[PDB]
Design an enzyme around this catalytic site. Structure first.
Site, mmCIF file in Angstrom:
data_model
loop_
_atom_site.group_PDB
_atom_site.id
_atom_site.type_symbol
_atom_site.label_atom_id
_atom_site.label_comp_id
_atom_site.label_asym_id
_atom_site.label_seq_id
_atom_site.Cartn_x
_atom_site.Cartn_y
_atom_site.Cartn_z
ATOM 1 N N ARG A 89 40.065 21.848 34.448
ATOM 2 C CA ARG A 89 40.486 22.789 35.479
ATOM 3 C C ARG A 89 39.661 22.614 36.750
ATOM 4 O O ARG A 89 40.212 22.504 37.849
ATOM 5 C CB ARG A 89 40.358 24.227 34.966
ATOM 6 C CG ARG A 89 41.447 24.716 34.006
ATOM 7 C CD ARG A 89 42.864 24.513 34.522
ATOM 8 N NE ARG A 89 43.406 23.200 34.189
ATOM 9 C CZ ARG A 89 44.519 22.701 34.714
ATOM 10 N NH1 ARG A 89 45.212 23.408 35.595
ATOM 11 N NH2 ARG A 89 44.943 21.496 34.352
ATOM 12 N N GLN A 172 42.287 44.865 39.804
ATOM 13 C CA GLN A 172 42.019 45.314 41.166
ATOM 14 C C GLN A 172 40.527 45.545 41.385
ATOM 15 O O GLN A 172 39.978 45.149 42.419
ATOM 16 C CB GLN A 172 42.811 46.582 41.472
ATOM 17 C CG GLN A 172 42.768 46.980 42.939
ATOM 18 C CD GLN A 172 43.372 48.346 43.197
ATOM 19 O OE1 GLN A 172 43.634 49.108 42.266
ATOM 20 N NE2 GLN A 172 43.595 48.662 44.467
ATOM 21 N N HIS A 176 38.137 42.769 43.753
ATOM 22 C CA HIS A 176 37.773 43.269 45.070
ATOM 23 C C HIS A 176 36.281 43.163 45.364
ATOM 24 O O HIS A 176 35.829 43.704 46.378
ATOM 25 C CB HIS A 176 38.248 44.712 45.233
ATOM 26 C CG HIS A 176 39.700 44.821 45.581
ATOM 27 N ND1 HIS A 176 40.675 44.089 44.938
ATOM 28 C CD2 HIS A 176 40.341 45.553 46.523
ATOM 29 C CE1 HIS A 176 41.854 44.377 45.457
ATOM 30 N NE2 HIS A 176 41.680 45.262 46.422
ATOM 31 N N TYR A 324 48.003 32.905 25.057
ATOM 32 C CA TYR A 324 47.726 31.828 24.120
ATOM 33 C C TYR A 324 47.327 32.391 22.762
ATOM 34 O O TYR A 324 46.747 33.474 22.659
ATOM 35 C CB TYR A 324 46.597 30.929 24.630
ATOM 36 C CG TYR A 324 46.825 30.256 25.967
ATOM 37 C CD1 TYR A 324 48.102 30.108 26.494
ATOM 38 C CD2 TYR A 324 45.750 29.765 26.703
ATOM 39 C CE1 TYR A 324 48.300 29.489 27.716
ATOM 40 C CE2 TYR A 324 45.938 29.149 27.924
ATOM 41 C CZ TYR A 324 47.213 29.013 28.426
ATOM 42 O OH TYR A 324 47.398 28.398 29.642
ATOM 43 N N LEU A 353 47.163 34.373 46.074
ATOM 44 C CA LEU A 353 47.671 34.325 44.775
ATOM 45 C C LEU A 353 47.377 35.599 44.018
ATOM 46 O O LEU A 353 48.202 36.049 43.339
ATOM 47 C CB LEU A 353 47.002 33.184 44.092
ATOM 48 C CG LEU A 353 47.821 32.058 43.616
ATOM 49 C CD1 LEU A 353 48.260 31.176 44.712
ATOM 50 C CD2 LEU A 353 46.915 31.270 42.783
ATOM 51 N N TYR A 354 46.218 36.190 44.177
ATOM 52 C CA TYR A 354 45.862 37.388 43.490
ATOM 53 C C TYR A 354 46.535 38.707 43.926
ATOM 54 O O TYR A 354 46.241 39.690 43.392
ATOM 55 C CB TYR A 354 44.353 37.515 43.481
ATOM 56 C CG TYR A 354 43.733 37.513 42.116
ATOM 57 C CD1 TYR A 354 44.018 38.505 41.211
ATOM 58 C CD2 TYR A 354 42.865 36.532 41.730
ATOM 59 C CE1 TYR A 354 43.484 38.507 39.982
ATOM 60 C CE2 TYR A 354 42.298 36.552 40.482
ATOM 61 C CZ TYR A 354 42.630 37.544 39.627
ATOM 62 O OH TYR A 354 42.096 37.590 38.434
ATOM 63 N N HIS A 357 50.550 43.093 43.343
ATOM 64 C CA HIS A 357 51.067 44.444 43.536
ATOM 65 C C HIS A 357 52.317 44.771 42.716
ATOM 66 O O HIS A 357 52.568 45.956 42.459
ATOM 67 C CB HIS A 357 51.340 44.678 45.022
ATOM 68 C CG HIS A 357 50.117 44.559 45.874
ATOM 69 N ND1 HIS A 357 49.839 43.438 46.623
ATOM 70 C CD2 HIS A 357 49.084 45.411 46.072
ATOM 71 C CE1 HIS A 357 48.695 43.610 47.260
ATOM 72 N NE2 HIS A 357 48.217 44.798 46.943
ATOM 73 N N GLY A 495 46.029 29.123 40.177
ATOM 74 C CA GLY A 495 45.045 30.186 40.090
ATOM 75 C C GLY A 495 43.965 29.989 39.046
ATOM 76 O O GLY A 495 42.820 30.407 39.253
ATOM 77 N N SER A 499 39.878 30.515 39.285
ATOM 78 C CA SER A 499 39.357 31.618 38.486
ATOM 79 C C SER A 499 38.159 31.187 37.646
ATOM 80 O O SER A 499 37.124 31.865 37.633
ATOM 81 C CB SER A 499 40.464 32.180 37.595
ATOM 82 O OG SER A 499 39.984 33.244 36.794
#
Ligand code: L7M
Ligand code: L7M
Ligand code: HEM
Ligand code: HEM
Ligand SMILES: *[C@@H]1O[C@H](CO)[C@@H](O[C@@H]2O[C@H](CO)[C@@H](O)[C@H](O)[C@H]2NC(C)=O)[C@H](O)[C@H]1NC(C)=O
Ligand SMILES: *[C@@H]1O[C@H](CO)[C@@H](O[C@@H]2O[C@H](CO)[C@@H](O)[C@H](O)[C@H]2NC(C)=O)[C@H](O)[C@H]1NC(C)=O
Ligand code: BOG
Ligand code: BOG
Ligand code: BOG
Ligand code: NAG
Ligand code: NAG
Ligand code: NAG
Ligand code: NAG
Lengths: 552, 552
Positions: A89, A172, A176, A324, A353-354, A357, A495, A499
């Site tokens: 990744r 969220q 943030h 998974y 991407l995040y 909503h 993403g 991440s």
């Protein structure tokens, strides 16, 4: 104008102008050669022939439950698999970082100025004929029209993976701390100069803010007791600046690390849970180390909570999302014999991407009540009214929305979805298919392949005309989901590298940090390594209510 | 007091208090076990048996000239040797960094606050009974007495390796971009937030300072022409703040990236050479890229000069100092298949070790003149009087002082040497022998072994009593040199790891940066890869005078 405007170089080679109307591709270490780096070397031909597609890999990871159950219980084998997840990744990320909103070429300013979000793909040059480069009309489709036709929610579409509101508000709350756009500067700028999981949303971004939040006894954070329950302190008591509407009573202006967490009781719920967890670990460390001062207790607790967060994010949160059968594992030791950069720079595309909503329901259901957005927002009396226990039980039961699949953004935050479109263009994002090629994904050849259906695709075809001009952000929310999944392929494959780089890039995962004495000994080390979302809630919420990231 | 005050853990294990009067050692990944990590594992016993000493390796690297001449001309073999130099050195450095002056334990504040110098060894805790921990008297010897008896220069001792003033001022100019102590905060604080070779001493530490130094045409830096020669602009023209005594005429207040470089004409000499080099590369890049704007020309030039600096430092500067017959090589590609962190944090001990003031002569000999320190300091009319060509020719001929060996600090800067002692204690440095063990060196067992002679050793024994209480900074300047070398073992073995980490840790050495398009194509790439101290002077100093880091 710019001869690189058409993105001519393929396979991650770099374009450089060699004149007013000519270009050169730097194919160094791409595995390809030729004018645009499209002729594969012999070994590259092999790798391409034998590499499965992400959709094939996803099928295997979510089927054969019996096989994965054996693998999960053979530590050597489970360790080997999780190791290839981590390395394969992180190769997709430039680390040290490269471009940003103002620099489409590498420069010392781009590398060293931490106020920028970094960029996985350079921006489209200012004097390119079209917004995406050379393709498409001179202006992109009206954003309000894109928003209304394919993004806004008609009927609430629940997540088929069963994500609940504990998950939505955890995502969220967690995100943030490193998505903190500096609107005084522009959308491509951030105020999270730590660029990762530093828990500044609990402890404050600056030392001055941190000291106002601290008790300076036993390493603990300031708190108040309301109705027998521990809650964060007030703005009046601490003088830390918080964002509140003018009518909020000062006894309700809670003060936490992140200045906007009074916006929603769901953010304030986790802020209280993590404040309690910090002080709980302080009691544990003080019992182990009666000889320790306040400063060392605070600092060691913060390092432990950073570890707990990364543990919970990988082994519960990413575990839930992924679907998974393989059990993901937080184990920094897996990278000790691997090449890996223990650093991170938050990408603007990761931020984009995040924007999940579609997770939000139409009402927030706490006990017997259903609150509208207007009733919910900026109203922490709801939290005091019901308490944390009722919050956890209610939000564990309430289902969240599906993110991919189209038409599931609640109209209450439609201005946020439009600004995502508007600011992505303002930041000169390249096209959806450019970002798919950047992450080794096959370009979409039609809107119908993108959505997997016909109605939204036809609306998108009337708006964009050319699939190669489709934008990244709307495409993520309209993409065909994986079978009964919350996301499509693009969300996962773009993403996941950002991440895990953010999670594993942290200094506490490096070999000189990942040892018991960093965390006050084996007792502090074990808090990290046994952490879970269930134990987080059990140790800190009265009655130890059952919780989970999915509805039961 | 603190039960870790005696530094009980050996072999890089970490000490943690487990009570008021007990400790525990964390031996994780040290290769040792036991109460203080002194019992070697089986494989550790092997490595210890077969590992040559630094003095043995030194002997081999500086003898067998015929063998090294063969190796130097076999690229595969030369690459293999330089690769092991790079990797085996960087293992001695904690990266990500750990301690600093205020934190003897790992903490997020220590990791994230860039205003600190980092520390290779934690400070001695405040409540330890003695300054070094438990050993020695309650107070260390008077610093003025240490200074006078073993540090101050009687007779000028020339460097047997032949270092000249071009080398001494290059080292002063080069190091002063990352040694910039923030005296407003304390000696353990830095103003070089880039923590490495970012060339802020040319371009400025802040963007606002950079823009005041820039011409904003063709990427170039502002300059003035005096007597047909290119010199830096003035404070009056640019408004960049510089440190000058009040009597300096404003036409002589030159403005450069580093605010203190008006202190000595030798620093201003290199500041002018590198200013000229920046604009020369701007001319080269503009010819290659007529389509480029001012901003991209400036940024690409800066990246190229960063590359040139690292090239010159490794293949000329370190090459000279080392005295090796093996030809060192700047080749980032050697680390691409190696584990290596492309990051750096400047260590306080690296700052201490680089106090090479014994280099300075008693007078500065330019053409037929000999200037005293009082005449030399803050007098840039000297530079305009003679010009750069005469400066280079004179400073190539003037020999510099030996650093190790004792009693060679010029009396003109005796206040600086005393502050190095005083501030090393203020920052709670551990002992000389602790730092030797930290870098895999055998502790000294007597002052006579430290110095290799009898007179200075006896003075030191009367002052310190115990060899285990000898301090790091004075020990570096009195240490027995290597045979006809400028330094002793401690200087080389502690300083070389910090030095190569700073150079190779730079982002431009990372695989996504190390390609021709980062530097404007193969033409800019070749400027880096053909750089030398001779070509630096030849391209920018009238007449292309011969230069070198050693007297001829
Ligand atoms: C799915 O839903 C999801 C959704 C989100 C996910 C993930 C999975 C994942 C797991 C991952 O990383 N997913 C991709 C790697 C799967 C394949 N990995 S592989 O090494 O290329 C490989 C290739 C071939 C065979 C393999 C194999 N065999 C033997 C069959 C075993 C293991 C790997 C194999 C991460 C981190 N998410 C994020 O946090 C994340 C957070 C925010 C955003 Cl906006 C987006 C994502
Ligand atoms: C000497 O004087 C000096 C003086 C300064 C030096 C150096 C050498 C060096 C070279 C180096 O790094 N010197 C140590 C590495 C030698 C051993 N390296 S080794 O890999 O362990 C190895 C072990 C065994 C056999 C080996 C061998 N064979 C086959 C015999 C070949 C090659 C390596 C072998 C560097 C960077 N300086 C600095 O910039 C520097 C700058 C500021 C400060 Cl204040 C201090 C230093
Ligand atoms: C009741 C719940 C929520 C409300 C009222 C809300 C509202 C908003 C608003 C007004 C913004 C714009 C903020 C700004 O630009 O300064 C925003 C941005 C954002 N939203 Fe939310 N949102 C909610 C839930 C969520 C959730 C569940 C996620 C993700 C799982 C999320 C992800 C984001 C992100 C990443 C940003 C960008 C933040 C930044 O760049 O600083 N939001 N949201
Ligand atoms: C005529 C030449 C020189 C003069 C007048 C001089 C004088 C000084 C002075 C007054 C300081 C204290 C500055 C401060 O603490 O803010 C200092 C610090 C220092 N000197 Fe020099 N020095 C000279 C040459 C050199 C050379 C040749 C080297 C090394 C090769 C060197 C290395 C250093 C270092 C590393 C510092 C610490 C700087 C910092 O931490 O900010 N100096 N010098
Ligand atoms: C990082 O980059 C931003 C953007 O260039 C810098 O902010 C600018 O600063 C200048 C003066 O330094 C101001 O005149 C501009 O108004 C600012 N522009 C924006 C868009 O904010 C910022 O100073 C840089 N940070 C560092 C540490 O260099
Ligand atoms: C890095 O650490 C220094 C030292 O603690 C911080 O400087 C202190 O800042 C506080 C308020 O923030 C002042 O009251 C003190 O006078 C300062 N002390 C010293 C010794 O300078 C500095 O703010 C920290 N930097 C960051 C970015 O957090
Ligand atoms: C070792 C056996 C490997 C089996 C390969 C399965 C490939 C599945 O392939 C995928 O199936 C999905 C449905 O689940 C579709 O939605 C995707 O379009 C398709 O690519
Ligand atoms: C904000 C909540 C929905 C607003 C929809 C505005 C109407 C414009 O959008 C239309 O909506 C129809 C109903 O879904 C679709 O069938 C059409 O394909 C779509 O173009
Ligand atoms: C393969 C041949 C190995 C040669 C090993 C030589 C070891 C030399 O040893 C060193 O010699 C120095 C003088 O040169 C002394 O100053 C050092 O104290 C001593 O350790
Ligand atoms: C890619 O190279 C081909 C020739 O190999 C050339 O015809 C084409 O113009 C290049 N790229 C683009 C975007 O046209
Ligand atoms: C705030 O929440 C309370 C419930 O605790 C509710 O009665 C009230 O109407 C809310 N206020 C607003 C302005 O919505
Ligand atoms: C090191 O361990 C030994 C026993 O193995 C113990 O006697 C000694 O006290 C320890 N260290 C110190 C500094 O005393
Ligand atoms: C400055 O240098 C000049 C030579 O250029 C010399 O004559 C003069 O005395 C110097 N000034 C001081 C104050 O040393």
């Amino acid at each position: 104008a710019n001869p690189c405007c058409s993105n001519p170089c393929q396979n991650r080679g770099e374009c450089m102008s060699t004149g007013f109307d000519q270009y050169k591709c730097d194919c160094t270490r791409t595995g390809f050669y030729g004018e645009n780096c499209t002729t594969p070397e012999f070994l590259t031909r092999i790798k391409l022939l034998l590499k499965p597609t992400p959709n094939t890999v996803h099928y295997i990871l979510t089927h054969f439950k019996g096989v994965w159950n054996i693998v999960n219980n053979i530590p050597f084998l489970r360790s080997l698999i999780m190791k290839y997840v981590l390395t394969s990744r992180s190769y997709l990320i430039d680390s040290p970082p490269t471009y940003n909103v103002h620099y489409g070429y590498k420069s010392w300013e781009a590398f060293s100025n931490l106020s920028y979000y970094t960029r996985a793909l350079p921006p489209v040059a200012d004097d390119c004929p079209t917004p995406m480069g050379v393709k498409g009309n001179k202006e992109l489709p009206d954003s309000k029209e894109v928003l209304e036709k394919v993004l806004l929610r008609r009927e609430f579409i629940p997540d088929p993976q069963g994500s609940n509101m504990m998950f939505a508000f955890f995502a969220q709350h967690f995100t943030h701390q490193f998505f903190k756009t500096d609107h005084k500067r522009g959308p491509g700028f951030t105020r999270g100069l730590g660029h990762g999981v530093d828990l500044n949303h609990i402890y404050g971004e600056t030392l001055d803010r941190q000291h106002k939040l601290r008790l300076f006894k036993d390493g603990k954070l300031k708190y108040q007791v309301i109705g027998g329950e521990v809650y964060p302190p007030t703005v009046k008591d601490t003088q830390v600046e918080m964002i509140y509407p003018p009518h909020i009573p000062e006894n309700l202006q809670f003060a936490v690390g992140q200045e906007v967490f009074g916006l929603v009781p769901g953010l304030m719920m986790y802020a209280t849970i993590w404040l309690r967890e910090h002080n709980r670990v302080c009691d544990i460390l003080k019992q182990e180390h009666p000889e320790w001062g306040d400063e060392q207790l605070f600092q060691t607790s913060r390092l432990i909570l950073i570890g707990e967060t990364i543990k919970i994010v990988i082994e519960d949160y990413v575990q839930h999302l992924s679907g998974y059968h393989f059990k993901l594992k937080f184990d920094p030791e897996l990278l000790f014999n691997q090449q890996f950069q223990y650093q991170n720079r938050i990408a603007s595309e990761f931020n984009t991407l995040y924007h999940w909503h579609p997770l939000l329901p139409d009402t927030f259901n706490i006990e017997d009540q259903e609150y509208s957005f207007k009733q919910f927002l900026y109203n922490n009396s709801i939290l005091l009214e019901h308490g944390l226990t009722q919050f956890v039980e209610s939000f564990t039961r309430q289902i969240a929305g599906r993110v991919a699949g189209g038409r599931n953004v609640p109209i209450a935050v439609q201005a946020v979805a439009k600004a995502s479109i508007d600011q992505s263009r303002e930041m000169k994002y390249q096209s959806l298919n450019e970002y798919r090629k950047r992450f080794s994904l096959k370009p979409y050849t039609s809107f119908e392949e993108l959505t997997g259906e016909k109605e939204m695709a036809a609306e998108l075809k009337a708006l964009y005309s050319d699939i190669d001009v489709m934008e990244l952000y709307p495409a993520l929310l309209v993409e065909k989901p994986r079978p009964d999944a919350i996301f499509g392929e693009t969300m996962v494959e773009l993403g996941a590298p950002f991440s895990l780089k953010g999670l594993m890039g942290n200094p506490i995962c490096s070999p000189q940090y990942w040892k018991p004495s960093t965390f006050g000994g084996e007792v502090g080390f074990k808090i990290i390594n046994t952490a879970s979302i269930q134990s987080l809630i059990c140790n800190n919420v009265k009655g130890c209510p059952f919780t989970s990231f999915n509805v039961q």
